[model samples]
Target: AECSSELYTEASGYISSLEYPRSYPPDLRCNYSIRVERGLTLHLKFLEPFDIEDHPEVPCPYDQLQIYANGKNIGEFCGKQRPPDLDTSSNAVDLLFFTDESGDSRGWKLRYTTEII
Candidate 1:
């Protein structure tokens, strides 16, 4: 598990479940935060295929990626398709990645940025 407890002020940056191109380890739990000005909004675009632990009939039975906006749980996602654009209600956003020791995949990536609207 990794941690990002720092407060970010930059308008744009990137975040990921694991290091680019590196497969995440088993039993992983990580947290990341993105912060911007109060008048801005956070956005995240999937940079790679979003693949976690999803059986054909079910989804996220093990590995899961959860996103939060202004401290509220957004949702848990797992699949090969790229997720739709994420628009946060506020400039502060949180991301949590969790995976069991059962199986692993290549991991995920997202380009997180902010916009004034």
Candidate 2:
């Protein structure tokens, strides 16, 4: 699939891997960026059934989901366990998804909201 860069400025919304609920394809990369007005923070919560290619002994060496806040890498995740909820420290956050040339799995979905601190 084609790599994409998306931007969201709404107060609340959801973002998911391409064709989510269906197994994602290999060699795909997607970047979802969210921006809220000043004095607001972003919160993210994974929906469910989050799946990605994972290694038993290694951390997310294959397909992975990563989070960044104001350009600071906050987390890197993979496997079946749903990632913990995130309350970003900045008004802007980026969700980056990457997959290798092989292996595919049902991808992830997440809801995001912005709130004043």
Candidate 3:
């Protein structure tokens, strides 16, 4: 119900923001928005969204990863390899949706947008 619409909206916003063909010179930016109706049971996440934007120096004038979910911190995960071992880059900040992985039966969705400069 709402989860489906939210998924669609997020996908649409990200795709529509692209300036065709989705090419970039590491200096592109865009606006993103997301909305959900109701009757949803999943969670939305942005995988490693922060890692990609954490660095504000390396030719990255701007970057952001915003998210809005029915639950504050219901379904979310970060760090790769689960164990957060030394090998895993501390820069990683991906959001994992548990229920979403199982689909409707589990109740989860991933909706997010990225802008770089």
lDDT values, one for every candidate: 0.76, 0.90, 0.25
2 or 3, which is superior by lDDT?
2
Native-to-model Cα distance after best TM-score fit, residue 65 in candidate 2, in Å: 0.7
Query: Which pairs, if any, clash in model 2?
Result: none
What TM-score does each of the candidates earn? Answer: 0.86, 0.95, 0.27
Cand. 2 Cα-lDDT = 0.90
RMSD of 2: 1.0
Error of 2 at 61 (Å): 0.9
Q: lDDT of candidate 3?
A: 0.25
lDDT of 3 by residue, 1-117 (tens): 111121243322232212222221233332223433333222323222222222334532233222324323222222221212111111112322211111111111233332221
Which numbered prediction scores highest in TM-score against the true structure?
2
Task: Report how far off residue 75 is in candidate 2 (Å).
Answer: 0.4
The runs of at least 3 residues in candidate 2 whose Cα sits more than 4 Å from the true structure, single-residue gaps closed, are: none
lDDT by residue for model 2 (5-115), tens: 999999999999988878887887889999999999999999898998899998999888999999999999999999999988789999899999887688999999888
